[PDB]
Design a protein around this ligand. Structure first.
Ligand SMILES: [Mg+2]
Ligand SMILES: [Mg+2]
Ligand SMILES: [Mg+2]
Ligand SMILES: [Mg+2]
Ligand SMILES: [Mg+2]
Ligand SMILES: [Mg+2]
Ligand SMILES: [Mg+2]
Ligand SMILES: [Mg+2]
Ligand SMILES: [Mg+2]
Ligand SMILES: [Mg+2]
Ligand SMILES: [Mg+2]
Ligand SMILES: [Mg+2]
Ligand SMILES: [Mg+2]
Ligand SMILES: [Mg+2]
Ligand SMILES: [Mg+2]
Ligand SMILES: [Mg+2]
Ligand SMILES: [Mg+2]
Ligand SMILES: [Mg+2]
Ligand SMILES: [Mg+2]
Ligand SMILES: [Mg+2]
Ligand SMILES: [Mg+2]
Ligand SMILES: [Mg+2]
Ligand SMILES: [Mg+2]
Ligand SMILES: [Mg+2]
Ligand SMILES: [Mg+2]
Ligand SMILES: [Mg+2]
Ligand SMILES: [Mg+2]
Ligand SMILES: [Mg+2]
Ligand SMILES: [Mg+2]
Ligand SMILES: [Mg+2]
Ligand SMILES: [Mg+2]
Ligand SMILES: [Mg+2]
Ligand SMILES: [Mg+2]
Ligand SMILES: [Mg+2]
Ligand SMILES: [Mg+2]
Ligand SMILES: [Mg+2]
Ligand SMILES: [Mg+2]
Ligand SMILES: [Mg+2]
Ligand SMILES: [Mg+2]
Ligand SMILES: [Mg+2]
Ligand SMILES: [Mg+2]
Ligand SMILES: [Mg+2]
Ligand SMILES: [Mg+2]
Ligand SMILES: [Mg+2]
Ligand SMILES: [Mg+2]
Ligand SMILES: [Mg+2]
Ligand SMILES: [Mg+2]
Ligand SMILES: [Mg+2]
Ligand SMILES: [Mg+2]
Lengths: 90, 113, 44, 54
RNA sequence: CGCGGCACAUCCACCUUGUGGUGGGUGUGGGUAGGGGAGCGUCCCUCAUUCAGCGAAGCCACCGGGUGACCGGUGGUGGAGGGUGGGGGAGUGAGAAUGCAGGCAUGAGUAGCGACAAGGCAAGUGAGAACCUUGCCCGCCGAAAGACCAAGGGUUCCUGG
RNA sequence: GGGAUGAGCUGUGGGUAGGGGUGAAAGGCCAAUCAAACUCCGUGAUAGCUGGUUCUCCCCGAAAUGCAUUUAGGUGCAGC
RNA sequence: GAAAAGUACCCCGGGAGGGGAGUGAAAGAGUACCUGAAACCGUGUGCCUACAAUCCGUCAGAGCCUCCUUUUCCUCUCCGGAGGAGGGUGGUGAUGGCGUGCCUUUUGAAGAAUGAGCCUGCGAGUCAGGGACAUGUCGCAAGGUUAACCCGUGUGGGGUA
């Protein structure tokens, strides 16, 4: 994915449209992530979170507003650093 | 019109026609007068049928909160469910078919003075 | 012969009339094992 | 012999309605202070504890 | 014969007088085999247009319509694809083939429940006992209905559920 | 009821394969089928024979005779 | 079902199954699960049927029941029609007349000739070819047209044998 475990995301489409939270666990073979605070499922005893689809979140660029995300060859290692669009940071 | 309760016994392994023979004894009787016809009735379907009238009176007592001395079996019927198909082998290579029939038994009791 | 039926089993005579190593002695039996591989049978 | 023609809905219901269980008569029994109902042919064994009322 | 509707043919008058339309006479319209002519319905593509999560398809009920196949309206159920018009193409219409696949009736709560050794009681276990356990009576087999192998079967054996 | 020391009955192992086997001979038997087995393929065999062939309306509307036929319950040509 | 959020807890019951809560937009989606038709089986209710001979319908037709509405009242009316008569939908049909199922095949069948127990689904004049004959229409017209092939992402442009 382009959304990792440690990132903080903004839900852009769903019942929880507009709520922020950090990823707890990512499931790459289903394109789904677990975000804390979103879609609280009232599971019967004997509440937690269900995974939403990864196309419903955008990565917060550590500066407020969300973004699509890109890549930049770091010129030292060759490993492509996952950089933000909308003025090119981290 | 009247307060009431419903109990269903789905997938009872009594034939539908042999269950209708015994529900015609207790239709329109009071519940204390229906659970003792089914006690001393020699048919085998009075086992499963009397466990639904007794639970429809227990549903009207617990959930709805009704006096059990005024209840009456207002509506009782029996339908059929699915049927297993079996083979009974016969003379000269013929193979016939046996039908294991099941039923759905619905009892709607109601409280009326 | 009263009451006697047609399949009296014996596993040694099954394999000496219908076995693998008797298929492989003639051309008519290699082409049976090949026509059962081509169909995809488990047992040849 | 075989059935020559199938019986219509008015002849297979006039016969089938005559296959039915006969109801029994019930009388009153007060043993051990608990009133029950048995048939009259079992009225003796109700007063002797030979009847299991479940 | 009278009064009103429809269709086909022919004749006489009109309108771009045959691609043919409107009006008025007389005649004609039972029909199998078969010939001719004109249409309804389901599906698919293309062009144009128009509905649909404020509820499409499909199904069910009701009220209406056309000369017919059939059509429209309103409502209920339901949850993503339809309507109309110019054209193109068909796995395009079933009631019969002792047709095929599936579901379900009638016969019918009927026949049958597989040897002519035969079971009974007490106590038990259990929600449930003619059939299970234990004890004692009764009966059957005893050149087998007893005890062992071979072929054959393949975990059916023992224990706990 | 017939044979029951014999041309006996039987176990196990082997042999004979389709116009061929085998037969103390009945066209019997050859895997519940035999006057030429079974399976697959040629193959969607052929049948002057039987059965079936699905929406509508409008107009018109027969024949069951002649001639020939390895022909007579088919078909060609004429008639309608 | 978008997500398993797959019905925690209580209740009748040995269980199976259910009821009340609960989850969900929907349980008219409950691992027997989208939509859920017909055959087929029930339960409740309106009418009819136990002196009558019935291809089960059709025309005539009384009586009951049900539901909408002009009339004259009950003016309690801002009411409701309260009931009856009048008229009209819908359901049943006492009673009278008429009335020999469907298909195939036949000189002729309700036929005691064949075929079908019922429902839903499938199931039969199609295609290939510069073929053959005859027509309807379109282009060019003393001429009409190319086949193989070549060149173009195409359905287009060349190609006279
Ligand atoms: Mg998205
Ligand atoms: Mg057998
Ligand atoms: Mg006429
Ligand atoms: Mg006509
Ligand atoms: Mg015709
Ligand atoms: Mg709705
Ligand atoms: Mg469609
Ligand atoms: Mg309609
Ligand atoms: Mg509608
Ligand atoms: Mg609709
Ligand atoms: Mg449509
Ligand atoms: Mg179109
Ligand atoms: Mg067309
Ligand atoms: Mg077809
Ligand atoms: Mg059909
Ligand atoms: Mg069948
Ligand atoms: Mg009988
Ligand atoms: Mg019997
Ligand atoms: Mg037995
Ligand atoms: Mg006992
Ligand atoms: Mg054992
Ligand atoms: Mg065991
Ligand atoms: Mg003897
Ligand atoms: Mg002698
Ligand atoms: Mg002797
Ligand atoms: Mg002979
Ligand atoms: Mg034989
Ligand atoms: Mg031959
Ligand atoms: Mg050939
Ligand atoms: Mg043929
Ligand atoms: Mg005529
Ligand atoms: Mg001719
Ligand atoms: Mg529950
Ligand atoms: Mg509920
Ligand atoms: Mg809710
Ligand atoms: Mg919605
Ligand atoms: Mg819904
Ligand atoms: Mg089901
Ligand atoms: Mg469903
Ligand atoms: Mg009378
Ligand atoms: Mg008469
Ligand atoms: Mg009549
Ligand atoms: Mg004849
Ligand atoms: Mg007949
Ligand atoms: Mg007859
Ligand atoms: Mg015949
Ligand atoms: Mg028949
Ligand atoms: Mg049929
Ligand atoms: Mg021309």
């Amino acid at each position: 994915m382009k959304v990792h475990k440690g990132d903080t995301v903004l839900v852009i489409s769903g019942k929880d449209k507009g709520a922020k939270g950090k990823v707890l666990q990512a499931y790459p073979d289903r394109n789904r992530v677990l975000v804390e605070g979103v879609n609280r499922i009232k599971k019967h005893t004997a509440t937690q979170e269900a995974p939403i689809h990864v196309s419903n979140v955008m990565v917060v660029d550590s500066d407020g507003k969300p973004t699509r995300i890109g890549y930049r060859v770091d010129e030292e290692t060759g490993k492509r650093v996952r950089i933000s669009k909308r003025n090119g940071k981290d | 019109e009247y307060p009431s309760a419903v109990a269903k016994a789905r997938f009872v392994r009594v034939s539908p026609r042999k269950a209708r023979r015994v529900i015609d004894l207790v239709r329109g009787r009071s519940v204390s007068d229906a659970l003792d016809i089914l006690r001393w009735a020699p048919q085998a379907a009075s086992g499963p049928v009397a466990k639904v009238i007794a639970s429809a009176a227990a549903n009207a007592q617990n959930n709805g909160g009704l006096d059990p001395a005024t209840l009456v079996v207002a509506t009782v019927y029996a339908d059929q469910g699915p049927t297993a198909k079996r083979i009974r082998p016969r003379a000269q290579g013929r193979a016939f078919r046996i039908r294991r029939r099941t039923s759905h038994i619905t009892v709607v009791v109601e409280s009326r003075p | 012969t009263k009451g006697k039926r047609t399949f009296q089993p014996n596993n040694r005579r099954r394999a000496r009339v219908h076995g693998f190593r008797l298929r492989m002695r003639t051309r008519a039996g290699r082409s049976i094992v090949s026509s059962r591989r081509r169909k995809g049978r488990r047992t040849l | 012999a075989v059935p020559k023609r199938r019986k219509s809905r008015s002849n297979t219901r006039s016969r089938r309605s005559q296959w039915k269980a006969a109801k029994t008569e019930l009388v009153g029994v007060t043993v051990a202070g608990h009133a029950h109902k048995v048939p009259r042919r079992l009225l003796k064994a109700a007063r002797l504890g030979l009847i299991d009322f479940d």
